[PDB]
């Protein structure tokens with residue numbers, strides 16, 4: 001479970017992310033589509049070429065959802081309600097894929113945050129991403 | 142999450158297991174060790190031979206915890222608090238292995254409950270074993 | 283793939299008593315019921331809202347027969363699973379867009395179904411042989427993904 | 429796992445810029461901190477109660493350098509991962525009793541360390557190549573388990 005130390009670590013790092021939320025989200029998606037090609041099976045309607053404005057736009061939306069999660073780190077289930085249902089009953093993304101995006105989000109963060117990506121912040125962030133994914137796959141069945 | 146029907150299916154299925162709970166517990170463990178050899182790394186001190194008094198003994202303990210979980214299905218976390226601490230702080234079994242044992246338990250019940258293992262019961266039991274695994278992994282980090 | 287002659291004889295002997303029609307519908311039906319998100323590819327099948335709807339659905343039974351029929355074809359060519367499933371692998375990726383994880387879920391459901399149908403015949407060692415087969419088939423179907 | 433000529437080259441080019449001593453300590457230390465249950469194999473390393481205790485632990489560093497020195501040897505022969513790691517695979521199973529899943533956790537932690545270390549140099553294509561390598565090493569190391 002996210003402890004107070006976890007919550008402050010995530011808040012501080014995301015605070016550093018700041019206005020780069022969108023671009024980091026787009027970068028994470030490109031790293032995911034490249035490193036784990038199977039995740040592409042969920043975006044057959046996307047222009048997935050290098051530099052795609054469609055991937056960029058989506059990256060911003062995924063970024064905004066996470067900023068919102070951080071802002072409601074105390075009650076994520078009620079803040080991520082609509083999205084959980086979306087993924088559970090409309091998108092139906094196999095749960096295994098959330099681990100892949102989370103890994104790619106961590107790598108992107110590590111590549112951009114040299115000062116704040118300490119072992120402890122790394123632990124908090126990983127825990128946070130697992131919780132977000134838990135909230136998003138909570139209504140699958 | 143566990144719906145009333147789920148709780149009802151689990152109880153019906155498990156009640157039919159009855160006094161055979163120990164034996165099924167041991168069979169699932171044996172099927173696990175053979176199908177997934179990597180699980181044996183946590184039992185280096187065990188006699189893993191077919192018919193081992195030690196596997197029979199451990200199977201009975203696992204079966205008892207499940208029978209107890211079924212009895213307090215509505216309050217599993219509190220009911221399994223101490224077992225959760227044990228795994229989280231002493232045994233430290235990687236989370237992935239819980240899915241392997243759950244699968245083998247399900248295969249064991251299928252092989253022993255021809256009439257009871259319906260698609261609906263199958264789903265309920267899979268959800269039940271998933272909640273149990275989640276409870277037992279709640280305190281890892 | 284990597285099966286000891288004893289394991290190969292095992293898988294073979296048991297499969298010869300399998301009626302792919304029955305077990306096919308059973309396996310695909312249970313997949314959709316136990317792991318509901320897998321229904322994302324079968325909206326055209328109609329009502330899959332309840333276990334009874336899924337199990338009695340004619341298209342579900344039909345697709346189950348086909349899938350298990352292809353699986354059966356893989357068992358006759360255990361020496362060349364990748365070669366045998368090459369076409370199907372490209373097809374599931376490029377045309378159907380099926381996340382390979384699904385093949386793994388179906389493999390596990392099938393093992394449960396064989397256990398349920400055969401009872402005591404489905405011994406722990408026979409199951410281990412089938413776990414390798416099911417994993418090998420899933421890997422052969424996921425090999426052309428890109 | 430299969431590495432294409434570009435992937436293999438991306439992997440070794442960058443590895444040449446890596447300080448195995450430093451990176452070994454970072455990776456193994458962050459492993460024990462991020463996934464606490466891994467500490468079960470290192471109870472004799474001393475205090476590992478906190479991130480700073482883990483990171484500054486000389487035994488952790490000495491061990492990180494050793495696992496990465498072997499990893500480094502495997503990278504020199506990307507086409508022979510299984511053979512290169514066959515003996516260590518038996519060791520980790522028979523003598524050490526280490527669950528192969530830990531090899532995968534360390535793999536992903538390593539990729540994070542390389543990203544943190546190299547920054548923008550750790551591009552998406554370079555990461556994709558490392559992900560294949562890291563999965564290949566874990567598979568080679570788990571290959572002799574029985």
Ligand code: HEM
Nearest residue numbers: 039042043061062065066086091093097098101102132136
């Ligand atoms: C870290 C968790 C994730 C977050 C925060 C997230 C967030 C979002 C958001 C904000 C949307 C848009 C919903 C709307 O229109 O209101 C969405 C759509 C979608 N997500 Fe997720 N998502 C996550 C993980 C995943 C994963 C792992 C995949 C699959 C690899 C995925 C696949 C999809 C797809 C297919 C769409 C539809 C995109 C489109 O058609 O425009 N998501 N997600």
Ligand code: HEM
Nearest residue numbers: 180183184202203206207232234238239242243273274277
């Ligand atoms: C279905 C979930 C599980 C349940 C209900 C469960 C139950 C138990 C119980 C009741 C015990 C005995 C505790 C005692 O001695 O007081 C125990 C011990 C243990 N469990 Fe778990 N466990 C679960 C899953 C697993 C899995 C997946 C593994 C690893 C493959 C595992 C490995 C162990 C080990 C190594 C011990 C110590 C046995 C010994 O040294 O004698 N458990 N577990």
Ligand code: HEM
Nearest residue numbers: 320323345348349352353370374378380384385388419423
């Ligand atoms: C042992 C694994 C499997 C085998 C051997 C297999 C085999 C087949 C075959 C032979 C076809 C027809 C191809 C054609 O001629 O167009 C097919 C179609 C299809 N399969 Fe797979 N399949 C497998 C697993 C899966 C799984 C797990 C799912 C998803 C949950 C899936 C979804 C589909 C879909 C969406 C179609 C198209 C059905 C239609 O045309 O109405 N398959 N599969």
Ligand code: HEM
Nearest residue numbers: 466469470494495496498499516524526530531534565569
């Ligand atoms: C990239 C994967 C890894 C490689 C290449 C590797 C390599 C090695 C090597 C070279 C040894 C020394 C063997 C000897 O003394 O002859 C060793 C020992 C050991 N490894 Fe691994 N290792 C890796 C990952 C792991 C992981 C993930 C863990 C567990 C979290 C682990 C736990 C151990 C332990 C407990 C020892 C014994 C250390 C001692 O003697 O005190 N290893 N490993």
